[PDB]
Write a protein that binds this ligand. Structure first.
Ligand SMILES: CCCCCCCC(=O)SCCNC(=O)CCNC(=O)[C@@H](O)C(C)(C)COP(=O)(O)O
Lengths: 71, 145, 71, 969, 242, 96
């Protein structure tokens, strides 16, 4: 909850198909920064590529949505 | 409504109607209601009037078109009257109990007159003019009396 | 046709005048009825004064040009 | 006023923006070609913006077809629509994936008050000379004016130093008072410029707006929200068909892709409705809610207060204060409670509080100043309480907005004070819903001042009073002086005829174009190609239905109201007006009179005197027992079989009646002669069978009924025929006569001048026929009520056709009465086409007819094929909107009654007779579906009419080419 | 239905208050809705039922029997059962006796055609090319009696009795139990001439080409009310005179 | 009103607001009506309004801040309405 603004207990209990994290207020901005800091780093051919997970999220993103087909 | 939209859509798809040319769906029973057999006749009257006036009345009760009808890309569901510059043909479709499906097509009357000569058209037009005057006379007299 | 027949049978060409003012009023009343029948909304009467009927052909031409559906 | 008004079942969802986009495109296209829009005016630009906001791939293909199929040689109007639509296709392709944006493009308009020479005050919204775009409006707000002054580059750069813009944001100083802030004001003005130029989106924004009726700032704010793509719950305290239609029209005009309008009934003056609405918004879709979480709250609901000073504070001011303060606080708390129960800390709802700059400066407004001033406590409560994370406070101090108070708006503009229109104020308010102002509210509550500099005039109340007094005195002095000058002139000099319309009902025969024009459209090879004897043409047509004849029904279908001719026809149909010719009250009268009072009624007055009654008693409406023999669906008469528990008191009866009773009951009745008079006493005993009437509340209270007062005597059917035949037969006879009139065949025997009596058929029929006669034979005969001995033949479905032939036609031509339930009329057209094509007839009466009666209604309710009127009332639906085809909420068909007839015949004979041709019956087919166990279930059986083989279509058929067929001919 | 004892009901005005009789809450409420102030309904706290007491002046219906003079009819042989031909009890309970007669006639007519399986027609023609152009003079008169009389009496009547009364319902049942065609459906009404109507319409259908095979003919049922109204018209023969 | 935040505004807060604001306005209106019916224009009643310096600073006080803050409209109403001669407004902002 504090870092990414979601409840693993709630996800286990309810198996939501979609989960929208909202980035409103100071807490939401901190969660958004946590989401933006998430990177996928890969040393390929001696070069350290740094892809970004959640490329949608920026300073103007008010929400993100985890999608699933069934849960 | 779902079945009729699906039938019209399948007809357009199979007959290869151009994409982005949905048939404009006129629903008379929002206003008149459902008579259990005058229905097709009322819709045929409306189709003839649409053909002659070029005006396609809208379904003013179409508060919100059902989302399932979006799949039928060859059907449009207006809510307000449209002043078209011409209606060529109108497809009247009825579905009564007992699996009584029915489809009629009314073409504009002006495609008939292209099948005759100039003189025949002229004499026909003069005769309809005289008949129209006589019918106006009879109709108004009979109305008042 | 009614207006033309009225002019033929009530307006004298040799004297260039109506034989009787009551006949003139009759024809003007008929033309006003024509205007009422064939006008789609409020409008000034084309024959405001009956004196215009001193040129009845002109008055009829004006009225039935304004309302050609009555011809 | 605290009476509850909200209910979940009554909420109306509008989300079919795809369909509304296509409809709006067709409307704009046709308006351009027809010349309703000769140039590219801001209305055309705004409609194009709505189309773009709803743009999707299906809409692109729709536009592409309708603009490529346009031919440009048909006058400059078609070339204009083609170029404009090409530009629109290009612009919609660009924003195919872009979010919908609220972009207002109407011309800004200022106030203009003019006093005529005769002291007549006229107010107009003239376009502003200096300001012409919303961008220029934003620049003007930033610049301000002299009165606002005090002792590549954004518009916040152009603000002059040491000035107060007309629109600004304030900042709370450490002392606790709000002052103009350059930084916040610059941010807000920059957002306004971005909105004015690029447009502002409201995607994924869930808004709750109250007080958004027609003619309010909330209505314009809701329009902008829908343009921007918001999911708006709009509330209304006047929930009705008019209001729901108004909101539907707004959604169909401005409802962008992804936008949903939820119109709910609501009383902001009742806390029960406040709680219920918030619960409905926040509940899951499974539990009957919306499953929404509000991003914005715009509680603009209020009631006016005029001439209510301190001494007049009373119930109305208390209720108004409740709405404007207490129930807004309750609504805000309800949203807080929902978000907290759901653990929502990071999605605050932005509450746009409508604040007044003036708190008691005008006076006589009841408690309005109290409510507006108390609404500023929320700024401090946001910091001092634990609801900051769920709600963000945005107080919009709304300035003078033009909707008495408009005649002096020009006067207050003369010192640099800026007064706004509803559109301008709505734009200013939607500027508070931009992402930057949203983030500003989340960081700390914001006080936007949109007052236009109205605060800087000293003694604004007294100044406004002096403006109104000056304008009033000028108008009154000018009026009095003009009147006195006129009277003096008339006294000195001593002492235009207006023509009113008269109803001229036209048969509306088809317009016959010149031969060259009619030949230009049909292929040149069609001449002599067709067998006109084998071509079927609808020569005439008519109907009797819930909107009278075909003419009046078509008027209400297309234009939604009656013209003079249609209204006079309806009044004559209903017997509201009759014709009188001769002496009347002495003087000679010729024209329409009131049927009951016999007083003269002018054609111009026919509408003003009978429109309300006509509408009330036409179309789909509550079932009238007087039109169905005292049939009241609320009190549906029944009988219950009971066993007699004790002998009834003897009652007198005839010899024959007593013998029938004894025959029935056997030993359970005693019949005894009365020697005094020879009658009989009948005494039912214990155990006898007995029937007690009972009444059932039936839930189909509405039907499409032929308008009240419709009489066959009005059309001329004699009373003997009326007493003989059924009402269905009367409807069919009137339809047949009107259809021959539409054909111009005033005398039906004139058909026999052209055809043999054997060559005129009648192929119309009924789904169920003479249901009144069926009720006679099955129920009133059972009850031993007086029923005509020949009610049997009056029940037949072919009896109406027989009466048509044996009252009007005298034909010996084919008679083929079809039954098809709801498809009998298409069945009839198909049978008639086959009759003419076979040659057994040359002229045919086709069409269909049916009657509404108690038992048919009840059985349709038993199958649940009709719509439950009680459910409709629970959903807030009126009879006029009960029948809503192709809608998400349609829940059964609306039963109606009447007849429809068409005179069809050969094209050759139609030309020979010189009759009008309304259309060519090119095809007429019937079909069955498939094997199944459900009779009323529809099916795709008629799809065979489009049956075609496509195994080898690499090359076109020569047979489908008309030049080939003409060569063979 | 015994024409010698034909059941009718006579409206009478109650002259003395009837002894109260028990009824349900709903039934007693319906009685009160009907009779207004001419009935008193009272809860029984012992069992929660209601007592219904009709008062002076209330409207009341006593059955009476009329001796009717058409005692003889041309009736299908006694013991004819659709189960004998193989129509299931569910169909027998769903449809009218007229529908059962039509189904048996259609099956026997295809047997006479040698078409044991109706789908063998689809080996030669399209499903669109097999029409049914038979019809009835009055159709499901049993279902009409249902809706107009037994529904009025509140006897158990199926909710879909109206669709079982239509004249095209029998042809619909033929198509959706045996044929499965999507060919033309044109149900004529001609009173005693509907079968010649049907043959003419079927001939027209085949000649127009909208069908290649057509089920023509006609059907009707004998019931109390139709018999009585033909007697009222004096179209039938008076059995007592005979 | 203690521990009554925004989400807790209810019957008690509405009644308190009635007492503190609405029925004070009604009382001043009643005094105005009596004086005007008696034709008293030269003996105004001095209404000493209890005003708070803080309007929502502490919170959790129901509609107390709303009542006190809306009580400041009477300054403008005194000039803008026709009860100035019967009542004079004296808002006393009461401290701790
Ligand atoms: C078949 C119907 C199609 C008609 C479509 C034609 C119009 C379009 O293509 S709309 C595309 C978007 N266009 C815009 O947004 C322009 C709006 N912005 C503008 O600055 C101006 O148009 C106005 C503000 C409207 C006025 O500006 P102006 O003084 O005319 O330069």
């Amino acid at each position: 909850k504090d870092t990414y603004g979601f409840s693993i207990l709630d996800i286990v209990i309810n198996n939501p198909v979609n989960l929208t994290i909202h980035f409103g207020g100071e807490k939401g901005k901190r969660i958004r920064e946590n989401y933006s800091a998430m990177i996928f780093e890969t040393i390929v051919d001696g070069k350290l590529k740094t892809e970004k997970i959640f490329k949608e999220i920026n300073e103007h993103s008010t929400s993100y949505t985890f999608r699933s087909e069934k849960g | 409504d779902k079945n009729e939209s699906a039938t019209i859509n399948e007809m357009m798809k199979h007959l290869g109607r151009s994409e982005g040319n949905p048939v404009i769906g006129v629903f008379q029973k929002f206003l008149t209601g459902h008579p259990k057999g005058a229905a097709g006749a009322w819709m045929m009257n409306g189709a003839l009037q649409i053909l002659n006036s070029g005006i396609i009345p809208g379904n003013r009760n179409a508060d919100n078109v059902d989302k399932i009808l979006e799949q039928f890309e060859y059907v449009l569901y207006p809510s307000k009257t449209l002043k078209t510059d011409g209606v060529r043909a109108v497809s009247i479709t009825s579905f009564g109990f007992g699996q009584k499906g029915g489809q009629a097509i009314v073409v504009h009357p002006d495609y008939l007159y292209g099948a005759i000569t100039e003189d025949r058209y002229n004499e026909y037009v003069a005769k309809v003019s005289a008949r129209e005057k006589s019918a106006y006379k009879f109709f108004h007299n009979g109305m008042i009396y | 046709e009614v207006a033309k027949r009225l002019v033929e049978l009530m307006f004298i060409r040799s004297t260039n005048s109506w034989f009787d003012v009551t006949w003139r009023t009759f024809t003007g009343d008929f033309l006003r009825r024509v205007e009422e029948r064939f006008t789609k909304s409020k409008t000034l009467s084309l024959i405001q004064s009956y004196s215009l009927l001193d040129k009845p052909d002109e008055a009829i031409e004006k009225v039935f040009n304004a309302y050609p559906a009555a011809r | 006023g605290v009476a509850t008004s909200f209910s979940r079942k009554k909420a109306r969802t509008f989300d079919s923006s795809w369909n509304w986009a296509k409809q709006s495109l067709l409307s704009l296209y046709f308006e351009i070609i027809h010349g309703v829009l000769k140039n590219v005016d801001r209305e055309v630009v705004s409609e194009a913006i709505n189309i773009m906001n709803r743009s999707n791939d299906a809409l692109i293909k729709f536009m592409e077809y309708h603009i490529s199929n346009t031919d440009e040689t048909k006058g400059e109007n078609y070339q204009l629509v083609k170029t404009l639509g090409e530009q629109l296709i290009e612009n919609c392709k660009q924003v195919l994936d872009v979010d919908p944006v609220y972009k207002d493009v109407a011309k800004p308009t200022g106030p203009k008050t003019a006093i005529d020479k005769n002291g007549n005050i006229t107010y107009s919204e003239e376009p502003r000379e200096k300001v012409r775009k919303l961008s220029q409006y934003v620049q003007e707000m930033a610049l301000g004016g002299p009165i606002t002054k005090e002792s590549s580059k954004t518009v916040s750069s152009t603000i002059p130093r040491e000035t107060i813009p007309f629109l600004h944001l304030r900042k709370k100083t450490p002392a606790g008072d709000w002052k103009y802030d350059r930084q916040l004001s610059s941010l807000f003005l920059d957002g306004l410029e971005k909105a004015a130029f690029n447009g502002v989106t409201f995607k994924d924004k869930y808004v709750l707006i109250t007080g958004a009726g027609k003619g309010s700032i909330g209505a314009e704010v809701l329009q902008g929200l829908l343009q921007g793509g918001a999911k708006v719950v709009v509330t209304t305290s006047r929930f009705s068909k008019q209001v729901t239609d108004y909101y539907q029209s707004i959604y169909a005009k401005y409802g962008a892709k992804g936008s949903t309008l939820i119109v709910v009934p609501f009383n902001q003056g009742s806390k029960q409705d406040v709680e219920a609405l918030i619960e409905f918004i926040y509940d899951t879709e499974k539990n009957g809610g919306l499953g929404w979480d509000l991003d914005a709250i715009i509680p603009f609901a209020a009631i006016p207060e005029q001439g209510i000073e301190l001494e007049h504070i009373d119930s109305k001011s208390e209720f108004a204060h409740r709405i404007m303060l207490t129930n807004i606080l309750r609504m805000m708390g309800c949203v807080k409670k929902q978000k907290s129960a759901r653990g929502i800390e990071t999605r605050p709802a932005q509450v746009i509080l409508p604040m007044s700059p003036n708190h008691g400066t005008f006076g006589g407004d009841g408690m309005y100043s109290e409510s507006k001033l108390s609404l500023e406590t929320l700024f401090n409560r946001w910091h001092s309480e634990s609801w900051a994370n769920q709600l963000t406070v945005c107080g919009a101090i709304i300035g003078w907005t033009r909707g008495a108070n408009n005649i002096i708006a020009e006067g207050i503009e003369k010192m640099g004070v800026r007064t706004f229109s509803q559109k301008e104020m709505a734009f200013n308010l939607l500027g508070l819903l931009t992402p930057e102002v949203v983030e500003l509210c989340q960081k700390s509550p914001v006080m936007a001042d949109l007052n236009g500099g109205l605060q800087f005039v000293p003694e604004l109340k007294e100044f406004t009073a002096k403006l109104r007094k000056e304008l009033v005195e000028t108008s009154e002095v000018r009026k009095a002086v003009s009147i006195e000058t006129a009277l003096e002139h008339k006294v000195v000099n001593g002492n235009q005829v207006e023509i009113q319309p008269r109803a001229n009902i036209q048969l509306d025969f088809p317009e016959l174009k010149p031969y060259k024009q009619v030949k230009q459209i049909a292929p040149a090879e069609l001449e002599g190609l067709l067998d006109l004897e084998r071509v079927i043409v609808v020569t005439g047509f008519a109907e009797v239905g819930p909107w009278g004849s075909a003419r009046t029904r078509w008027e209400m279908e297309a234009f939604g109201e009656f013209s003079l001719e249609g209204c006079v026809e309806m009044a004559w149909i209903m017997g509201f007006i009759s014709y009188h010719n001769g002496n009347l009250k002495g003087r000679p009268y010729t024209g329409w009179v009131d049927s009951k009072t016999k007083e003269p009624v002018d054609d111009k007055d026919v509408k003003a005197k009978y429109e309300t009654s006509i509408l009330e008693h036409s179309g789909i409406r509550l079932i009238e027992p007087e039109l169905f023999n005292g049939y009241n669906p609320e009190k549906k008469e029944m009988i219950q079989e009971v066993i007699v528990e004790e002998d009834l008191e003897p009652f007198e009866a005839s010899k024959e009646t007593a013998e029938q009773f004894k025959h029935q009951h056997g030993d359970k009745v005693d019949i005894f002669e009365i020697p005094e008079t020879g009658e009989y006493s009948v005494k039912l005993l214990k155990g006898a069978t007995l029937y007690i009437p009972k009444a059932l509340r039936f839930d189909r209270l509405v039907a499409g009924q032929i308008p009240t007062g419709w009489n066959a005597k009005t059309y001329g059917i004699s009373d003997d025929i009326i007493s003989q035949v059924d009402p269905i037969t009367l409807f069919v006879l009137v339809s047949v006569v009107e259809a021959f009139i539409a054909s111009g065949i005033t005398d039906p025997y004139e058909m026999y001048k052209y055809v043999h009596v054997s060559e005129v058929g009648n192929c119309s029929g009924s789904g169920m026929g003479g249901v009144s006669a069926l009720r006679g034979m099955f129920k009133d005969r059972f009850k031993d009520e007086p029923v005509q001995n020949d009610i049997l033949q009056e029940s037949f479905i072919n009896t109406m056709s027989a009466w048509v032939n044996m009252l009007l036609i005298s034909s010996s031509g084919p008679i083929k009465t079809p039954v098809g339930a709801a498809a009998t009329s298409v069945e009839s057209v198909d049978i008639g086409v086959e009759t003419i094509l076979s040659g057994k007839a040359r002229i045919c009466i086709v069409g269909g007819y049916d009657d509404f009666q108690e038992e048919g209604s009840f059985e349709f309710g038993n199958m649940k094929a009709t719509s439950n009127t009680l459910e409709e009332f629970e959903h807030g639906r009126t009879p006029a909107e009960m029948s809503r085809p192709a809608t998400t909420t349609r829940n059964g068909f609306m039963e109606a009654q009447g007849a429809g007839i068409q005179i069809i015949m050969q094209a050759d004979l139609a030309l020979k007779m010189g009759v009008p041709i309304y259309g060519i019956v090119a095809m007429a087919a019937t079909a069955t579906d498939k094997i199944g166990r459900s009779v009323p279930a529809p099916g795709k059986g008629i799809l065979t009419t489009a049956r075609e083989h496509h195994s080898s279509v690499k090359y076109a058929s020569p047979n489908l080419n008309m030049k080939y067929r003409k060569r063979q001919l």
